[PDB]
């Protein structure tokens, strides 16, 4: 019957890794030659920015990151002092495939390698606090194995799609998943709805518009809410 403490100001950092420019995925990595630049991802980054600033998080945007950069950014957050924070959010917008996300330079980063950097042992100042990841990306090429996060408690990963499949991005409106997620958080958090309940609503909205099926994976052990001013 408990809820994660969510009262500090700011609540925590909301890292946003936004990948748009995939030139090298065609200039340095032979197989993604037809990989299109992610038009519309900027609207997504802006929606996430305004959604979470309203929810009192400190936004830390980073655009066009190669896999090496993603790792160094994540490493800096792993080492930071979160002792005065109640939560940590990391959003990753990019191209992807089965269980992984692509850096702009076409290199790969297994989602599990990213999330597991924040276990209690590795990032003590977030031990016992919710670590939330939102990833907009494809997870294969099927259109209609990894377990993504550690088994220890307090992780929430919101994926735009089940593994092996794609997710859609409307160049003029943003991605289906991120746009739906932000709209629901903005409308529902002020009403006291918990984040998992919100994600089920997102599963529903996105699945109603091929079809796309989002999928939360998590080890949360308390109700998660983002109290809205």
């Amino acid at each position: 019957d408990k809820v994660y403490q969510m009262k500090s100001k700011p609540r925590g950092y909301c890292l946003i890794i936004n990948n748009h420019n995939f030139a090298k995925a065609r200039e340095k990595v032979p197989k993604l030659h037809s990989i299109r630049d992610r038009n519309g991802t900027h609207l997504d980054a802006g929606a996430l920015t305004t959604t979470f600033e309203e929810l009192h998080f400190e936004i830390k945007p980073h655009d066009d990151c190669t896999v090496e950069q993603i790792y160094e950014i994540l490493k800096i957050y792993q080492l930071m002092d979160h002792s005065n924070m109640d939560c940590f959010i990391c959003c990753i917008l990019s191209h992807g495939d089965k269980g992984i996300i692509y850096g702009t330079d076409g290199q790969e980063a297994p989602i599990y390698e990213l999330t597991s950097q924040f276990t209690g042992l590795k990032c003590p100042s977030l031990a016992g606090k919710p670590k939330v990841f939102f990833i907009q990306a494809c997870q294969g090429d099927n259109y209609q194995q990894t377990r993504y996060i550690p088994d220890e408690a307090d992780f929430l990963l919101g994926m735009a799609t089940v593994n092996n499949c794609v997710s859609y991005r409307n160049p003029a409106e943003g991605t289906w998943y991120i746009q739906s997620l932000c709209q629901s958080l903005r409308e529902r958090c002020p009403r006291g709805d918990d984040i998992l309940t919100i994600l089920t609503e997102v599963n529903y909205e996105v699945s109603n518009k091929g079809k796309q099926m989002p999928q939360p994976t998590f080890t949360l052990r308390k109700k998660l809410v983002f109290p809205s001013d």
Binding site: R36, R38, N39, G40, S94, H95, G96, Q136, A137, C138, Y143, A160, V166, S167, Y168, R169, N170, P171, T175
Partner: peptide, 5 residues
């Protein structure tokens, strides 16, 4: 055009 990621 509706693009896949």
């Amino acid at each position: 055009a509706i693009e896949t990621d």
